[PDB]
mmCIF file of C-alpha atoms in Angstrom:
data_model
loop_
_atom_site.group_PDB
_atom_site.id
_atom_site.type_symbol
_atom_site.label_atom_id
_atom_site.label_comp_id
_atom_site.label_asym_id
_atom_site.label_seq_id
_atom_site.Cartn_x
_atom_site.Cartn_y
_atom_site.Cartn_z
ATOM 1 C CA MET A 267 95.422 75.909 112.512
ATOM 2 C CA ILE A 268 98.201 77.934 110.867
ATOM 3 C CA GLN A 269 100.319 80.727 112.331
ATOM 4 C CA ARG A 270 102.777 83.031 110.539
ATOM 5 C CA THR A 271 105.751 84.895 111.999
ATOM 6 C CA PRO A 272 105.721 88.704 111.664
ATOM 7 C CA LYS A 273 107.860 90.454 109.072
ATOM 8 C CA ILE A 274 109.280 93.735 110.330
ATOM 9 C CA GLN A 275 110.578 96.891 108.682
ATOM 10 C CA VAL A 276 111.871 99.835 110.711
ATOM 11 C CA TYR A 277 112.255 103.010 108.705
ATOM 12 C CA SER A 278 111.487 106.706 108.646
ATOM 13 C CA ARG A 279 108.698 108.123 106.507
ATOM 14 C CA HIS A 280 111.079 110.781 105.164
ATOM 15 C CA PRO A 281 114.886 110.643 104.838
ATOM 16 C CA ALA A 282 116.632 110.999 108.183
ATOM 17 C CA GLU A 283 118.028 114.476 108.862
ATOM 18 C CA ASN A 284 119.248 115.258 112.376
ATOM 19 C CA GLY A 285 117.098 118.019 113.843
ATOM 20 C CA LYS A 286 114.445 117.719 111.111
ATOM 21 C CA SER A 287 110.978 116.440 112.020
ATOM 22 C CA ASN A 288 110.112 112.932 110.818
ATOM 23 C CA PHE A 289 107.930 109.897 111.561
ATOM 24 C CA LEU A 290 109.338 106.635 112.876
ATOM 25 C CA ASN A 291 107.636 103.678 111.195
ATOM 26 C CA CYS A 292 107.540 99.974 112.025
ATOM 27 C CA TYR A 293 105.768 97.982 109.307
ATOM 28 C CA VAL A 294 104.668 94.587 110.651
ATOM 29 C CA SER A 295 103.358 92.276 107.928
ATOM 30 C CA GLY A 296 103.072 88.641 106.927
ATOM 31 C CA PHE A 297 101.923 87.541 110.393
ATOM 32 C CA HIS A 298 98.999 85.479 111.660
ATOM 33 C CA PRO A 299 96.887 85.818 113.766
ATOM 34 C CA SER A 300 96.130 89.485 114.424
ATOM 35 C CA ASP A 301 96.958 89.539 118.145
ATOM 36 C CA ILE A 302 100.410 91.139 118.226
ATOM 37 C CA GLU A 303 102.301 93.640 120.385
ATOM 38 C CA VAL A 304 104.429 96.284 118.635
ATOM 39 C CA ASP A 305 106.419 98.930 120.530
ATOM 40 C CA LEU A 306 108.686 101.740 119.335
ATOM 41 C CA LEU A 307 111.833 102.330 121.394
ATOM 42 C CA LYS A 308 114.199 105.277 121.885
ATOM 43 C CA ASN A 309 117.531 104.234 123.453
ATOM 44 C CA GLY A 310 115.703 101.273 125.002
ATOM 45 C CA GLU A 311 112.715 103.033 126.600
ATOM 46 C CA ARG A 312 109.088 102.628 125.546
ATOM 47 C CA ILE A 313 107.868 105.533 123.425
ATOM 48 C CA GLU A 314 104.370 106.619 124.415
ATOM 49 C CA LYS A 315 101.624 107.931 122.119
ATOM 50 C CA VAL A 316 102.518 105.339 119.467
ATOM 51 C CA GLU A 317 99.585 104.784 117.099
ATOM 52 C CA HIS A 318 98.781 102.129 114.520
ATOM 53 C CA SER A 319 96.830 101.772 111.294
ATOM 54 C CA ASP A 320 93.601 99.812 111.055
ATOM 55 C CA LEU A 321 93.983 96.061 110.767
ATOM 56 C CA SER A 322 94.103 94.587 107.276
ATOM 57 C CA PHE A 323 95.427 91.457 105.607
ATOM 58 C CA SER A 324 97.180 90.436 102.404
ATOM 59 C CA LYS A 325 96.003 88.038 99.682
ATOM 60 C CA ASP A 326 97.310 85.022 101.612
ATOM 61 C CA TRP A 327 95.135 86.298 104.501
ATOM 62 C CA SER A 328 98.225 87.318 106.482
ATOM 63 C CA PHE A 329 97.910 90.704 108.167
ATOM 64 C CA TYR A 330 99.944 93.905 107.913
ATOM 65 C CA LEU A 331 100.065 96.786 110.406
ATOM 66 C CA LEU A 332 101.999 100.067 110.602
ATOM 67 C CA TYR A 333 103.040 101.454 114.003
ATOM 68 C CA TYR A 334 104.160 105.077 113.930
ATOM 69 C CA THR A 335 104.967 108.149 116.011
ATOM 70 C CA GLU A 336 106.570 111.509 115.263
ATOM 71 C CA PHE A 337 110.159 112.078 116.395
ATOM 72 C CA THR A 338 113.256 114.184 115.713
ATOM 73 C CA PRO A 339 116.419 112.177 114.954
ATOM 74 C CA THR A 340 119.817 113.047 116.433
ATOM 75 C CA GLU A 341 123.357 111.710 116.049
ATOM 76 C CA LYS A 342 123.273 109.429 119.112
ATOM 77 C CA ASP A 343 119.596 108.577 119.658
ATOM 78 C CA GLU A 344 119.120 104.861 119.042
ATOM 79 C CA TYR A 345 115.800 103.439 117.885
ATOM 80 C CA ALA A 346 114.301 99.992 117.468
ATOM 81 C CA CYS A 347 110.971 98.236 117.062
ATOM 82 C CA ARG A 348 109.823 95.719 119.667
ATOM 83 C CA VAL A 349 107.359 93.092 118.461
ATOM 84 C CA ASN A 350 105.973 90.109 120.361
ATOM 85 C CA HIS A 351 103.819 87.465 118.704
ATOM 86 C CA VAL A 352 102.688 83.935 119.540
ATOM 87 C CA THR A 353 104.963 82.753 116.714
ATOM 88 C CA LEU A 354 107.933 84.387 118.495
ATOM 89 C CA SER A 355 109.755 82.608 121.313
ATOM 90 C CA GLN A 356 110.885 86.006 122.629
ATOM 91 C CA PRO A 357 110.695 89.669 121.594
ATOM 92 C CA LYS A 358 112.310 90.163 118.186
ATOM 93 C CA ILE A 359 114.859 92.980 117.882
ATOM 94 C CA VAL A 360 114.992 95.093 114.726
ATOM 95 C CA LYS A 361 117.277 98.116 115.068
ATOM 96 C CA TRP A 362 116.511 101.275 113.107
ATOM 97 C CA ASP A 363 119.132 101.997 110.438
ATOM 98 C CA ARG A 364 119.061 105.200 108.411
ATOM 99 C CA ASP A 365 120.140 103.410 105.214
ATOM 100 C CA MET A 366 117.904 100.321 105.330
ATOM 101 C CA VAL B 166 79.137 101.426 100.306
ATOM 102 C CA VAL B 167 78.751 97.912 101.715
ATOM 103 C CA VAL B 168 76.819 94.773 100.795
ATOM 104 C CA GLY B 169 73.260 94.867 99.454
ATOM 105 C CA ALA B 170 71.754 94.967 102.950
ATOM 106 C CA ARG B 171 71.114 91.294 103.646
ATOM 107 C CA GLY B 172 73.733 88.679 104.474
ATOM 108 C CA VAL B 173 73.365 84.915 104.230
ATOM 109 C CA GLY B 174 74.423 82.825 107.205
ATOM 110 C CA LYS B 175 77.195 80.273 106.787
ATOM 111 C CA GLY C 28 92.815 104.206 84.615
ATOM 112 C CA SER C 29 91.341 101.040 86.090
ATOM 113 C CA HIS C 30 90.287 101.119 89.737
ATOM 114 C CA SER C 31 89.032 98.764 92.425
ATOM 115 C CA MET C 32 86.994 99.092 95.597
ATOM 116 C CA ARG C 33 87.866 96.485 98.219
ATOM 117 C CA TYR C 34 86.540 95.810 101.708
ATOM 118 C CA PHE C 35 88.473 93.693 104.210
ATOM 119 C CA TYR C 36 86.596 92.190 107.158
ATOM 120 C CA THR C 37 88.227 90.386 110.083
ATOM 121 C CA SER C 38 86.285 88.894 112.996
ATOM 122 C CA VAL C 39 88.308 87.164 115.724
ATOM 123 C CA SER C 40 86.558 85.354 118.569
ATOM 124 C CA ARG C 41 88.043 85.947 122.030
ATOM 125 C CA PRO C 42 86.673 83.355 124.471
ATOM 126 C CA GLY C 43 86.436 84.537 128.061
ATOM 127 C CA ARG C 44 87.051 88.134 126.933
ATOM 128 C CA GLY C 45 83.757 89.276 125.367
ATOM 129 C CA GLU C 46 82.366 89.357 121.843
ATOM 130 C CA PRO C 47 84.748 88.901 118.894
ATOM 131 C CA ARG C 48 86.815 91.807 117.613
ATOM 132 C CA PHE C 49 85.324 93.032 114.330
ATOM 133 C CA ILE C 50 87.467 95.123 111.981
ATOM 134 C CA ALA C 51 86.316 96.561 108.645
ATOM 135 C CA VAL C 52 88.368 98.690 106.246
ATOM 136 C CA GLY C 53 87.298 100.219 102.934
ATOM 137 C CA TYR C 54 89.694 100.787 100.047
ATOM 138 C CA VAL C 55 89.683 102.508 96.693
ATOM 139 C CA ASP C 56 92.864 101.344 94.920
ATOM 140 C CA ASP C 57 95.446 101.611 97.762
ATOM 141 C CA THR C 58 93.656 104.510 99.502
ATOM 142 C CA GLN C 59 91.750 103.554 102.640
ATOM 143 C CA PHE C 60 88.642 105.664 103.178
ATOM 144 C CA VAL C 61 86.339 104.060 105.802
ATOM 145 C CA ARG C 62 86.879 101.992 108.932
ATOM 146 C CA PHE C 63 84.973 100.252 111.687
ATOM 147 C CA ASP C 64 86.373 98.769 114.891
ATOM 148 C CA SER C 65 84.204 96.838 117.345
ATOM 149 C CA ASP C 66 86.353 98.130 120.220
ATOM 150 C CA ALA C 67 86.336 101.841 119.341
ATOM 151 C CA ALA C 68 83.949 103.942 121.418
ATOM 152 C CA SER C 69 82.303 105.718 118.463
ATOM 153 C CA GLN C 70 80.325 102.645 117.301
ATOM 154 C CA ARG C 71 80.267 104.252 113.849
ATOM 155 C CA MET C 72 81.848 103.744 110.466
ATOM 156 C CA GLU C 73 84.482 106.418 110.482
ATOM 157 C CA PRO C 74 85.901 108.411 107.555
ATOM 158 C CA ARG C 75 89.591 107.981 106.793
ATOM 159 C CA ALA C 76 89.827 109.998 103.542
ATOM 160 C CA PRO C 77 89.084 113.669 102.834
ATOM 161 C CA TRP C 78 86.642 113.055 99.970
ATOM 162 C CA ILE C 79 84.538 110.606 102.011
ATOM 163 C CA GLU C 80 84.115 113.106 104.874
ATOM 164 C CA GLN C 81 81.484 115.067 102.912
ATOM 165 C CA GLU C 82 79.087 112.095 102.906
ATOM 166 C CA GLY C 83 75.799 112.896 104.611
ATOM 167 C CA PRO C 84 74.639 111.480 107.943
ATOM 168 C CA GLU C 85 72.251 109.060 106.216
ATOM 169 C CA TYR C 86 75.321 107.458 104.626
ATOM 170 C CA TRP C 87 77.108 107.000 107.955
ATOM 171 C CA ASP C 88 73.944 105.771 109.681
ATOM 172 C CA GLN C 89 73.316 103.207 106.930
ATOM 173 C CA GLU C 90 76.936 102.074 106.600
ATOM 174 C CA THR C 91 77.212 101.618 110.372
ATOM 175 C CA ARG C 92 73.990 99.582 110.484
ATOM 176 C CA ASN C 93 74.928 97.317 107.568
ATOM 177 C CA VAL C 94 78.476 96.801 108.873
ATOM 178 C CA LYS C 95 76.944 95.969 112.255
ATOM 179 C CA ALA C 96 74.857 93.379 110.405
ATOM 180 C CA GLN C 97 78.091 91.933 108.989
ATOM 181 C CA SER C 98 79.355 91.911 112.592
ATOM 182 C CA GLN C 99 76.477 89.748 113.843
ATOM 183 C CA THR C 100 76.704 87.499 110.772
ATOM 184 C CA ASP C 101 80.380 86.896 111.588
ATOM 185 C CA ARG C 102 79.683 86.070 115.244
ATOM 186 C CA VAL C 103 77.039 83.496 114.274
ATOM 187 C CA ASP C 104 79.296 81.915 111.642
ATOM 188 C CA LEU C 105 82.174 81.519 114.125
ATOM 189 C CA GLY C 106 80.118 79.084 116.183
ATOM 190 C CA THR C 107 78.646 77.426 113.092
ATOM 191 C CA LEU C 108 82.150 76.751 111.784
ATOM 192 C CA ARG C 109 83.272 75.732 115.270
ATOM 193 C CA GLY C 110 80.601 73.049 115.003
ATOM 194 C CA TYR C 111 81.674 72.178 111.457
ATOM 195 C CA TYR C 112 85.311 71.823 112.541
ATOM 196 C CA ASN C 113 84.467 70.459 116.025
ATOM 197 C CA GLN C 114 86.906 72.769 117.809
ATOM 198 C CA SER C 115 86.985 73.733 121.472
ATOM 199 C CA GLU C 116 84.924 76.778 122.431
ATOM 200 C CA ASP C 117 87.924 77.983 124.487
ATOM 201 C CA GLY C 118 90.196 78.697 121.526
ATOM 202 C CA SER C 119 90.276 81.948 119.594
ATOM 203 C CA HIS C 120 89.386 81.686 115.902
ATOM 204 C CA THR C 121 89.439 83.994 112.888
ATOM 205 C CA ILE C 122 87.120 84.662 109.941
ATOM 206 C CA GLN C 123 88.419 86.929 107.175
ATOM 207 C CA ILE C 124 86.135 88.268 104.432
ATOM 208 C CA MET C 125 87.256 90.259 101.385
ATOM 209 C CA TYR C 126 85.079 91.403 98.491
ATOM 210 C CA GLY C 127 85.041 94.149 95.902
ATOM 211 C CA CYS C 128 84.581 95.180 92.299
ATOM 212 C CA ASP C 129 86.820 96.500 89.518
ATOM 213 C CA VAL C 130 86.084 98.964 86.707
ATOM 214 C CA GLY C 131 88.030 99.944 83.613
ATOM 215 C CA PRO C 132 89.040 103.406 82.392
ATOM 216 C CA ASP C 133 85.478 103.815 81.053
ATOM 217 C CA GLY C 134 84.045 102.926 84.465
ATOM 218 C CA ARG C 135 82.486 99.737 83.100
ATOM 219 C CA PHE C 136 82.459 96.582 85.213
ATOM 220 C CA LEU C 137 85.413 94.197 84.877
ATOM 221 C CA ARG C 138 85.434 91.736 87.785
ATOM 222 C CA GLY C 139 83.713 90.915 91.055
ATOM 223 C CA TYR C 140 85.318 89.376 94.121
ATOM 224 C CA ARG C 141 84.298 87.543 97.283
ATOM 225 C CA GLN C 142 86.653 85.411 99.366
ATOM 226 C CA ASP C 143 86.058 84.053 102.868
ATOM 227 C CA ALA C 144 88.687 82.480 105.100
ATOM 228 C CA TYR C 145 88.775 80.570 108.384
ATOM 229 C CA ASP C 146 91.894 80.683 110.584
ATOM 230 C CA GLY C 147 93.947 82.148 107.754
ATOM 231 C CA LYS C 148 92.965 79.479 105.205
ATOM 232 C CA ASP C 149 90.683 79.547 102.182
ATOM 233 C CA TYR C 150 87.141 78.482 103.079
ATOM 234 C CA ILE C 151 84.699 79.440 100.289
ATOM 235 C CA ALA C 152 85.260 81.699 97.287
ATOM 236 C CA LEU C 153 82.879 83.253 94.788
ATOM 237 C CA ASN C 154 83.928 82.008 91.356
ATOM 238 C CA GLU C 155 84.524 84.320 88.407
ATOM 239 C CA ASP C 156 81.067 83.602 86.972
ATOM 240 C CA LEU C 157 79.461 85.145 90.114
ATOM 241 C CA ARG C 158 77.041 82.194 89.987
ATOM 242 C CA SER C 159 78.938 79.317 91.650
ATOM 243 C CA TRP C 160 81.265 78.700 94.582
ATOM 244 C CA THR C 161 84.496 76.814 95.266
ATOM 245 C CA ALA C 162 84.818 74.820 98.493
ATOM 246 C CA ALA C 163 88.164 74.051 100.129
ATOM 247 C CA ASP C 164 87.015 71.259 102.480
ATOM 248 C CA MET C 165 84.014 69.154 103.464
ATOM 249 C CA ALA C 166 82.901 71.902 105.854
ATOM 250 C CA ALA C 167 82.609 74.414 103.004
ATOM 251 C CA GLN C 168 80.429 71.942 101.086
ATOM 252 C CA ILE C 169 77.906 72.448 103.895
ATOM 253 C CA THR C 170 77.944 76.202 103.257
ATOM 254 C CA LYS C 171 78.199 75.677 99.483
ATOM 255 C CA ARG C 172 74.930 73.733 99.324
ATOM 256 C CA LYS C 173 73.334 76.072 101.871
ATOM 257 C CA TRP C 174 74.237 79.060 99.714
ATOM 258 C CA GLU C 175 73.229 77.155 96.586
ATOM 259 C CA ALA C 176 69.920 76.393 98.313
ATOM 260 C CA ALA C 177 69.656 79.884 99.848
ATOM 261 C CA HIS C 178 70.682 81.532 96.540
ATOM 262 C CA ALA C 179 73.372 83.686 98.151
ATOM 263 C CA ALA C 180 75.113 84.320 94.814
ATOM 264 C CA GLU C 181 71.995 86.169 93.619
ATOM 265 C CA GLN C 182 72.471 88.860 96.279
ATOM 266 C CA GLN C 183 76.238 89.285 95.872
ATOM 267 C CA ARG C 184 76.208 89.613 92.072
ATOM 268 C CA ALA C 185 73.466 92.252 92.292
ATOM 269 C CA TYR C 186 75.618 94.462 94.524
ATOM 270 C CA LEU C 187 78.917 93.743 92.751
ATOM 271 C CA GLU C 188 77.361 94.590 89.371
ATOM 272 C CA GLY C 189 75.374 97.496 90.828
ATOM 273 C CA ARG C 190 75.943 99.425 94.048
ATOM 274 C CA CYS C 191 79.604 98.358 94.177
ATOM 275 C CA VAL C 192 80.676 99.832 90.825
ATOM 276 C CA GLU C 193 78.071 102.625 90.964
ATOM 277 C CA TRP C 194 79.591 104.073 94.137
ATOM 278 C CA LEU C 195 83.146 103.317 93.028
ATOM 279 C CA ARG C 196 82.394 105.742 90.192
ATOM 280 C CA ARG C 197 81.157 108.331 92.703
ATOM 281 C CA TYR C 198 84.133 108.012 95.065
ATOM 282 C CA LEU C 199 86.577 108.222 92.154
ATOM 283 C CA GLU C 200 84.691 111.270 90.877
ATOM 284 C CA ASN C 201 84.361 113.127 94.180
ATOM 285 C CA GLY C 202 87.904 111.999 94.998
ATOM 286 C CA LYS C 203 89.278 112.704 91.525
ATOM 287 C CA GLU C 204 91.635 115.238 93.110
ATOM 288 C CA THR C 205 93.559 112.485 94.940
ATOM 289 C CA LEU C 206 92.597 109.143 93.361
ATOM 290 C CA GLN C 207 93.688 109.889 89.767
ATOM 291 C CA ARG C 208 97.272 110.710 90.784
ATOM 292 C CA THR C 209 100.304 108.718 89.648
ATOM 293 C CA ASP C 210 103.179 109.600 91.990
ATOM 294 C CA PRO C 211 106.442 108.495 90.329
ATOM 295 C CA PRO C 212 109.100 106.911 92.551
ATOM 296 C CA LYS C 213 112.008 109.020 93.777
ATOM 297 C CA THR C 214 115.014 106.729 93.398
ATOM 298 C CA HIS C 215 118.621 106.634 94.579
ATOM 299 C CA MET C 216 121.325 104.079 95.311
ATOM 300 C CA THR C 217 123.493 103.367 98.339
ATOM 301 C CA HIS C 218 126.743 101.441 98.702
ATOM 302 C CA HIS C 219 128.066 99.701 101.821
ATOM 303 C CA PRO C 220 131.189 97.511 101.761
ATOM 304 C CA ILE C 221 130.807 94.247 103.662
ATOM 305 C CA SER C 222 134.468 93.234 103.425
ATOM 306 C CA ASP C 223 137.640 93.933 101.436
ATOM 307 C CA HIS C 224 136.229 91.911 98.517
ATOM 308 C CA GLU C 225 132.440 92.454 98.566
ATOM 309 C CA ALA C 226 129.940 95.294 98.853
ATOM 310 C CA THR C 227 126.182 95.852 99.059
ATOM 311 C CA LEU C 228 124.211 97.878 96.520
ATOM 312 C CA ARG C 229 120.701 98.856 97.622
ATOM 313 C CA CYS C 230 118.381 100.360 95.001
ATOM 314 C CA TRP C 231 115.759 102.678 96.463
ATOM 315 C CA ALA C 232 112.381 103.978 95.326
ATOM 316 C CA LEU C 233 110.400 106.220 97.667
ATOM 317 C CA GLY C 234 107.196 108.202 97.667
ATOM 318 C CA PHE C 235 105.551 106.297 94.814
ATOM 319 C CA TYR C 236 101.827 105.594 94.423
ATOM 320 C CA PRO C 237 100.158 103.295 93.724
ATOM 321 C CA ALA C 238 102.279 100.574 95.316
ATOM 322 C CA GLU C 239 102.598 98.342 92.241
ATOM 323 C CA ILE C 240 106.209 98.712 91.117
ATOM 324 C CA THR C 241 109.006 96.532 89.741
ATOM 325 C CA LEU C 242 112.638 96.677 90.861
ATOM 326 C CA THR C 243 115.040 94.592 88.780
ATOM 327 C CA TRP C 244 118.785 94.196 89.300
ATOM 328 C CA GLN C 245 120.782 93.124 86.249
ATOM 329 C CA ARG C 246 124.425 92.140 85.781
ATOM 330 C CA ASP C 247 125.616 92.959 82.247
ATOM 331 C CA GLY C 248 121.937 93.243 81.320
ATOM 332 C CA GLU C 249 120.869 89.807 82.624
ATOM 333 C CA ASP C 250 118.343 89.710 85.471
ATOM 334 C CA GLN C 251 119.893 88.601 88.770
ATOM 335 C CA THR C 252 118.165 86.570 91.487
ATOM 336 C CA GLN C 253 121.007 85.009 93.480
ATOM 337 C CA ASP C 254 122.634 87.383 95.978
ATOM 338 C CA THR C 255 119.553 89.615 95.764
ATOM 339 C CA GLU C 256 117.285 90.802 98.569
ATOM 340 C CA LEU C 257 113.758 92.113 97.969
ATOM 341 C CA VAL C 258 111.631 93.371 100.866
ATOM 342 C CA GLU C 259 107.885 93.978 101.061
ATOM 343 C CA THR C 260 106.421 97.101 99.515
ATOM 344 C CA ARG C 261 105.767 99.365 102.480
ATOM 345 C CA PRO C 262 103.629 102.483 102.953
ATOM 346 C CA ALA C 263 105.390 105.687 103.926
ATOM 347 C CA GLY C 264 102.311 106.695 105.936
ATOM 348 C CA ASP C 265 101.282 109.761 103.893
ATOM 349 C CA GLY C 266 99.575 107.947 101.023
ATOM 350 C CA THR C 267 102.839 106.946 99.313
ATOM 351 C CA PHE C 268 104.803 103.700 99.311
ATOM 352 C CA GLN C 269 108.427 102.622 99.611
ATOM 353 C CA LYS C 270 110.485 99.678 98.396
ATOM 354 C CA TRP C 271 114.103 98.704 97.911
ATOM 355 C CA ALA C 272 116.069 95.904 96.261
ATOM 356 C CA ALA C 273 119.635 94.924 97.113
ATOM 357 C CA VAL C 274 122.499 92.986 95.546
ATOM 358 C CA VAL C 275 125.940 91.995 96.824
ATOM 359 C CA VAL C 276 128.679 92.734 94.288
ATOM 360 C CA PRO C 277 132.438 92.062 94.340
ATOM 361 C CA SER C 278 134.556 95.122 95.035
ATOM 362 C CA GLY C 279 135.413 96.954 91.830
ATOM 363 C CA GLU C 280 132.547 95.281 89.930
ATOM 364 C CA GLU C 281 129.727 97.698 90.830
ATOM 365 C CA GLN C 282 129.772 99.182 87.313
ATOM 366 C CA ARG C 283 128.466 95.962 85.727
ATOM 367 C CA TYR C 284 125.181 96.042 87.697
ATOM 368 C CA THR C 285 122.044 98.052 86.898
ATOM 369 C CA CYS C 286 118.783 98.508 88.801
ATOM 370 C CA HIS C 287 115.635 98.771 86.670
ATOM 371 C CA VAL C 288 112.637 100.619 88.125
ATOM 372 C CA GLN C 289 109.237 100.288 86.438
ATOM 373 C CA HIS C 290 106.171 102.208 87.586
ATOM 374 C CA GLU C 291 102.839 103.476 86.299
ATOM 375 C CA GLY C 292 103.641 107.135 86.979
ATOM 376 C CA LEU C 293 106.957 106.965 85.126
ATOM 377 C CA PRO C 294 106.715 107.667 81.376
ATOM 378 C CA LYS C 295 109.797 105.513 80.741
ATOM 379 C CA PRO C 296 111.691 102.994 82.904
ATOM 380 C CA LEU C 297 114.635 104.295 84.922
ATOM 381 C CA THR C 298 118.040 102.597 85.001
ATOM 382 C CA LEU C 299 120.203 103.297 88.051
ATOM 383 C CA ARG C 300 123.926 102.603 88.081
ATOM 384 C CA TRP C 301 126.469 103.091 90.836
ATOM 385 C CA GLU C 302 128.029 106.408 89.761
#
C-alpha cells in the first residue's frame, strides 16, 4: 500500500508581536496514513496542553491536521514543531519563523 | 444530517 | 452563493489494539460543524459550530445512531476487503469515505458525490449520473456487482437529492450569520536578501474565507513559475485561512515583479508590488 510523507507549516494564527497573546500553529498535511505524532516545542521542551483538530483528508485521500496551543512570543523564545511519521526516518525539524 | 439510514455492505 | 455539504469518514483497523478508529467530520463549505470520534468518551456526534448547537436532542440521538451504523459498516468492510485483497490480518488498513451534495444560489441541486477509498487509493466511486459506479480494480468489481445487485445507488441518490440538500438549506439558513460571509484577504509583502545579488519576495494573504484563492507572481506582467514557491492553503484556526507565494528576484529588480491576489470576497483583484 501507499504512504505519504507529512507536509509541515509552523506559523502563528495572528502576526507575531512580543508580549501579545497568540496561537502557535503546526499544520500537518499531505501525509498517509493517519497515525502521526506532532509536538509543539518551546526552546526544545515539550509544550503540554497541545490540542489538535479532528482528522480529515484531502481529495487525494491524504490527511491534514492542525496542532495548536496558545502562547505569548518573546524576543528569545525559540519554537519548533516536532513530527514523527512512519514515512520519516527520524523526527523532522521545522523551526518557527515569524516571516514564513 | 447523514445517510438515509441504511447502508449497503461492501 | 453556491454551497456544499461534505462528510469525511475514516476508519482505520488497529490489529491487536481493539476495534478500528472511526472518525467522522461534517462540513458546510469550509466550516466544520459536527464530529464523531470512536475514541472520545462522549460516544455522541458533537457540535463544532454555533448554529448547529441549537439542534434538538432527537437530532443528536439520530445522528449518533446512524453514524454508529456507518461505524459498524466500516468494520465489516475492512475484513471483506482484507479477503478481497488477501492481506494479513495483522496489518493496519484504512477505509476513507467522502460524500456530499452541492446547491446553487437558488438552493437547487447541482451535484451529488460519493467516493470510497482503501489504503489511500480510489476503490469505488459514484458516477455523476448517480445511477452507476466506477471500479478501480478487480476487487471493486465484486462490490460493483453487489451494489448493482443490491441497488445501493437507489438509496444514495434519494438522500443526495433529498435530505442532503434539504438540510444544507436549513444549516445555511440557520447559519446565515456566519456561512454567507466573504472575508477578503489581508495582504502584504516581505523582502529578505539571500545574497549580494538575489533576494526573496514573499506575497502574503491572511484571514481570508473561504479558502479558495489565487496568488500569481508576474515579471513584467508575464506569469512566473520558475523560482516560485507556493505552499498549501492553511487555516488560521479561527475560521479563516492563510496562504503565501514567494519568488526569488535579482537585487535591484524587485520593481519588475507583481503579485496578483484573486478572491471571492474581493470586488476587484489586488496587485502588490515591492514599494
